[PDB]
Design a protein around this nucleic acid. Sequence first.
DNA 1: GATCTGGCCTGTCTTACACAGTGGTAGTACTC
DNA 2: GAGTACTACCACTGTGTAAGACAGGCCAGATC
DNA 3: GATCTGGCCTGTCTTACACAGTGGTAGTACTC
DNA 4: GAGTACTACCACTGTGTAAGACAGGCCAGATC
Lengths: 351, 351, 542, 542
Amino acid sequence: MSLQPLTAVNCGSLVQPGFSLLDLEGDVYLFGQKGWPKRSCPTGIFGVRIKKGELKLRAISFSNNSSYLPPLRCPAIAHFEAQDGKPECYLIHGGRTPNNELSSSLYMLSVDSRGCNRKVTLRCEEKELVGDVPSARYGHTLSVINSRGKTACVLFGGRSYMPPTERTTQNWNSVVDCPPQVYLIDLEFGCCTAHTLPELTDGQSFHVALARQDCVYFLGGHILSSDCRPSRLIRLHVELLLGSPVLTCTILHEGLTITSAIASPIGYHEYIIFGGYQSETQKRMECTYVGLDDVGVHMESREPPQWTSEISHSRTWFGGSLGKGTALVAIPSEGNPTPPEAYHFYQVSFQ
Amino acid sequence: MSLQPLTAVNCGSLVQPGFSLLDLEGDVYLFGQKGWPKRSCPTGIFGVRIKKGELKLRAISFSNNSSYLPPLRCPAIAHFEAQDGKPECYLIHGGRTPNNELSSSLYMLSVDSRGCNRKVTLRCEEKELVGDVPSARYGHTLSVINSRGKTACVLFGGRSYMPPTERTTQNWNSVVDCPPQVYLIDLEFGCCTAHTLPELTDGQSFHVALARQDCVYFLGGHILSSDCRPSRLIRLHVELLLGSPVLTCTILHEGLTITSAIASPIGYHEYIIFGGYQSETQKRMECTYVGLDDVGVHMESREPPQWTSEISHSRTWFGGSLGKGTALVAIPSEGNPTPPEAYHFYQVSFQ
Amino acid sequence: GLHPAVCLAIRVNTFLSCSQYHKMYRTVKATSGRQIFQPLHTLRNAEKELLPGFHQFEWQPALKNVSTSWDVGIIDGLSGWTVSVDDVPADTISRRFRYDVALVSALKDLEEDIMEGLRERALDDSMCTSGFTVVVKESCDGMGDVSVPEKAVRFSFTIMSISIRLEGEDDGITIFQEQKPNSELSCRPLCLMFVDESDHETLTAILGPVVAERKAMMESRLIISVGGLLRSFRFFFRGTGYDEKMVREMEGLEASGSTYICTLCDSTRAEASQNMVLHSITRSHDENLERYEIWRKNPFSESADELRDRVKGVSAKPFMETQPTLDALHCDIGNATEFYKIFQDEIGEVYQKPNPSREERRRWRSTLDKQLRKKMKLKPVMRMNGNYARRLMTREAVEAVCELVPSEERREALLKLMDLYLQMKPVWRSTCPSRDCPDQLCQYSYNSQQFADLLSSMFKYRYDGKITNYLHKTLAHVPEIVERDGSIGAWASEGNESGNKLFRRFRKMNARQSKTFELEDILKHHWLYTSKYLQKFMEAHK
Amino acid sequence: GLHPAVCLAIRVNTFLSCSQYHKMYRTVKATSGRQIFQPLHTLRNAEKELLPGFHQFEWQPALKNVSTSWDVGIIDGLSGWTVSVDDVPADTISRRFRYDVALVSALKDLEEDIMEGLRERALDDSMCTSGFTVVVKESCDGMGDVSVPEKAVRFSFTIMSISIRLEGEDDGITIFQEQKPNSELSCRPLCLMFVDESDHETLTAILGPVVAERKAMMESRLIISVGGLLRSFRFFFRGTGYDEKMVREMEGLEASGSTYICTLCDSTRAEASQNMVLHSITRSHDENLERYEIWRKNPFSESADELRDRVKGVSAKPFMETQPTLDALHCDIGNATEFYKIFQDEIGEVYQKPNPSREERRRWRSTLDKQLRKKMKLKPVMRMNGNYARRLMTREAVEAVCELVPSEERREALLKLMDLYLQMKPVWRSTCPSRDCPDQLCQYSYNSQQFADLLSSMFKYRYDGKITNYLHKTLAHVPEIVERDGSIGAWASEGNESGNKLFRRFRKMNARQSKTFELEDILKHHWLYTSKYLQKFMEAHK
DNA sequence: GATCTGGCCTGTCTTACACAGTGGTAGTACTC
DNA sequence: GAGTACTACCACTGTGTAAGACAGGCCAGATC
DNA sequence: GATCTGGCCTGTCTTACACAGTGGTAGTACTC
DNA sequence: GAGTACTACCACTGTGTAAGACAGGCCAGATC
Ligand SMILES: [Ca+2]
Ligand SMILES: [Ca+2]
Ligand SMILES: [Ca+2]
Ligand SMILES: [Ca+2]
Ligand SMILES: [Zn+2]
Ligand SMILES: [Zn+2]
């Protein structure tokens, strides 16, 4: 639990508040960026190298059978874990394009080959969805669950634009929460099912959802109809029965009033929540350890590091987990002239 | 001949284009600062310390019997050399006040006592003038001569303001050359005599005058009536017969078209001319050795150091001799914002 | 006594505050009063006939996802950006008119001129109220240094021509056409933002509604009470007031010294040194869409570079239909900065000394600028502007430069070059070439042919594999563009960029000054500044 | 029809360029014409009656080293600086009129009001043409941020009062006195420079002629054709529009937190904490001259410090006579920044905690500014300006601050303090105290007595040896100054600093823009801007 | 090797420096 | 009697400086 | 220990960005 | 016939940048 300020040496114009960090095979990959892909990097995915307090970025390449891939802005991000057939993927759906559309396609992003000279190639299979498909949305969440012993993928939450009939050119950037249904995406085949829940009365967005071995705990979101931040916690339990996936749910008594968090994983099924925002003006400044078992979730305050004055007086902030209890955080920077390095960076670490 | 750029660490604002360097007892003293004397230094005279490529300034103090002393701007400066009674003075007359008046008083500036802790005290005796006094002027010159075996002091050249009857408030900053007389100042008593010369047909200013053992060689001045820079070197030969100091003069064939030079002494009677300006647009960039004997003056180009681009593209420049073949030169500096260090400094050295 | 409209225009057109104008009004009113000027509050009431949001109109069929209110004025440009803190922030300050309302405003302002266009063509007016066709030039540009620059983007449009196709058996009777299409005084602002050109994220967030509405207007017909009668208009949009940088940014091309150089062709950069003149127009907005889908899905499983070359440089999703054309002004500036460089490299000799230093390049620039100052009386410029480019592409500046190059075939060569250039510049600078320089229009292919071939011959040391983009366009594409559309220079960005000059004046003397209001004020004052109706009060028979 | 003078003033007073005014002239002339406004060249011809260099005058006896030409206009201020390269450079850009010409201009402009004052006091007019006395307030200040600041100095004067002493058995019949002496519109510029206040070398080179002329005019009498008759004027100059930094710089004193604090007394800083109220005025320009003589010759051969003390802080040679007085506005700003600090050190506790940190001071500043924002709705300021200082010295801002200091003895103490201050502020802020607030003028000694003694008692922790200069002046010197010179606030430099605001305007919109000309233009427009004759055309019976 | 001292430094205090001038709103003179 | 015009209300940038005197702290450094 | 190679660097090339708009002067339309 | 007004002449700031593609150079560094 120490934070040390890094400095990003060259290339800092290629990072924007909503971005994604993917931990693939020990190597960390930044995903999503400001702009369309420049031709310095016609793929749009970058490799992150931390060294000596420096953040360096390397241009990753694709394979020949891979589909190219727009830079989604706040997409939903699923660590598909190493199993049959091909480990060990990373589902992306669907986020927001660099031209502000909303994505209505699912991408499976895996590792493919190495080396030669510490070169890695990834690949993207655009996975086609037949349903009952979910609507284009963002800030929602995707998780993977195993039941006897088939594997499926649950998708819930998020914001979207108003329906195309009521969407107006004075409503155009207005958002509303999407209807509170859950989606079971099986990933081969591409069959989606939508399930409605008596307990899930209203949609939410920018929440964290943690799954383990067929139970999913949805922690504190942000509800936009009532602009309340519920502190309750939802636990839903699925089981994939031939061939209708029955799905039960419960409201648990107390969870956590956060939004837009950083969940670094440290243990087997144990994470640490680095904090987005508690109230509309006041960002959550304390760290929280969240272990979860089959009794349920357990939860303890750890004491946070000494936030610098700079990361304490910022208005907004964001970042994400380099994994294994380490994360990257970012602060907008104010200077005249513009630095033009737009964001100061810190590296946080557990123990 | 080497030039090495210095940097003046602190107290950058206390130097202005026309200033004087007096070499007293091995220590060098800057004299004539911008402004009236601040209370950092209520005397107005500074000690120069060169070390480590740094220029440092130290506040000198006076004695109790000393007169205080306005910061003259382009005064005429005479190294009175060590003899009877009290060595080894420095005559100043008269320069231009910080409030732009012209000085009509003569100051004798000597060393007085040391230490304790590398502390030196100077003194100023305001010397009263009885004559035939010279008029307030500046840019003129003063030299010391010895004849059988009495010591007197010859004063010649310079600019002044137009006479007080034709001086108009649209002529106020206009200058004209004062009449080309020479003044014999004996230094006790304060007896001044004026002498007119058939060969000295027009006054001149900003020239260098070099004396040795009752002969004085005036090198290239600037004449402001005809806006020419004569290259004719003047040589005048005095002798103090009581009661009338008879005084002869010759025009010598060729001297040197310079103005406002830096004459460092290196030898017994040998100097080096570091150059002011050749023509109104084009500063003299080459150095010149000037040895002088009793046959006359001899004169040879040495090759100059490699002037940096910075000291080559300046419009104006000034400076003065730190003595013993070493001198200080100054260049106005251009930047945005203002540095506010107004002048870049170099140290020049012979051999 | 003066009409309140006239004095409104006096106050807008001479750059006066409310409080300055009032000081003068009370002053001229107590000496010799008899009131001459109107008071302020009756100009505030006088103008509401001229701002957008005043006349009643309606569309048939209704507009797709556009509201039916017809009286909306100045909105803020965020367009309902929900301002939660967890989403991307709503930092932008932007203001705008709702596009169609400002359209109907500009038409009701040209109602005098459409009516007298009708009477002058001796066409009847109770009939022919159904088939009018307006051609609208849209135009957008970023703008720096409005004291960080806090740059500004300023999306405007201009009504170019209005013709009539009713009732049948014909194709169109032009009724109005713009005599001075490159003036400020005909470039009407629609939307302002404090945005950088480059961050495609904010520009698309603010401009998303606008393009949606444009896309919504291409099907319906407008219905306006014009001349007492309800009449039907339809619209054709020609997006041409974009400098090239922006056309590439908004057509999914890569910018801008790419391997794909033309906006209109598929030729690579080196391939457009060999063949300088033989290229057909191929690119279209809807094919950029199809090729971007080639890029996303990769249906043949090719590598990065085989894909890039399969798709001829469409790696971004096109986001705005743009007319595939050129910009007269920026063509001028490119050719002038090219010729300035060629002269600089010919004073020093670089066909003998094939690789020169940077410091001899500086020597040669300084001597060129001194020479051009001694004769031709020009000063040096930080950056090429329009006046310099016009003065630089003269016979006698070349002739005063040729006195420094020694070999008189390089001399007679580049004199042949410049005079060729002058023999073909008016075809792309003309407001209408087919009428105002027709022989140059037909001699264009031959003239450009010899220009290309003389570059191939006597400059091969420079143009072996690299050409500037404008030179490419000017040599391979001009005849076909001007045959398809009718004119060049008529569609330039000049009027828009020229309007930025005005934008600067308003920001100083008419600021609120606050961000929440500064655009609402610049926007109102700029819109008055352009209405024809107040410009006729301005000329008043001269 | 309008008179050409009136419209000239319309064009100066509303900030219009020639080409803007012309656009409006031509516009209002082709709608509804009948010409209303005059054209430009007839205004260019109309003003030369109003600029300096038009009326014929003469001095008796002739002016010492001042030329006899009476028709000289705008000169450049270098005054014939021979531009050799070996002398100190002639870098300065400066412009100016010629002092006496602008004087005679300002009197021929007040011709109407001198005559009407003559008729209104029922004094005859062909008699009494010899005994006039004018009192002239001159005034100088530096000025920054005219986009390095490229600071500006702006030496101006104002005609305060004109009275009559002819023919004998009397002292003087005031005929005019300035009703609004602190306004801009009565502050006539005389000389402008691009100079810093601080470098005494350029300021004395440009201002040397000016002081020579002032020194030359105190002996002679002026002779002017006013109301048909030649009449004789005498002048008394009162140099009072100098802030304190400038007075010290210009009187040879050391600046400004010295050991010698007062400009009017000899008391040391520590000695002006023990005795706060008992000091007589001693310093004069001529005594500064003879004390500087003491300093330079050192006739008793004493040390540095013993000599400085012998001469009471005169170490520089005085170069300009200055009236020994104070500046009402800057006194306000000093006392407001003092009370702002005192509040800051009472919210936090200091008389308990005798040494606090800077970061506690910062906490206290933030809380004070928040408190003054909650009630009193003020924002915080970088620097104290006149409006803030005026609003800050109110009963109810103290009252809203006292809600944060806990002990109701400190509370009632500083309430007694503030109300004392308000009981004595009007004697030094008044344009004429002896008529407008006479009982405070009588009660001033007593009121200030108790103010000093309450500071002695309840603030000893702050004012043990350190006091601010204005507090000293306001506590020890006000009764004697206002008894000798009749009034305070009437002579402040506020009106001058207020005209710096105008200077800024003209630089932005009436610039050449070039240095050789920019001053000739600011200077012409500022001089027009002030002449009374165009201001009556401005009010015209309101 | 001890002094100490003259000189550098650091902080603190005091004196000036930017922030008007422009839309819109509305009470209010004030009057057809 | 209201309706006009005028004039005074409010929002608001930006929320630090730039030189200098003097107290005091103190330390190079050189002598004693 | 040799390769070599993927990646960092450096320079070069290309595409935009500021520079109007204001006084005075004078020819010149142009007209009482 | 000239004398008016209008409109077009001139002087002039300031004399660099800001991102990005691509060629080429080349080197860390890691494997072979
Ligand atoms: Ca542009
Ligand atoms: Ca001031
Ligand atoms: Ca001041
Ligand atoms: Ca552009
Ligand atoms: Zn092409
Ligand atoms: Zn006093």
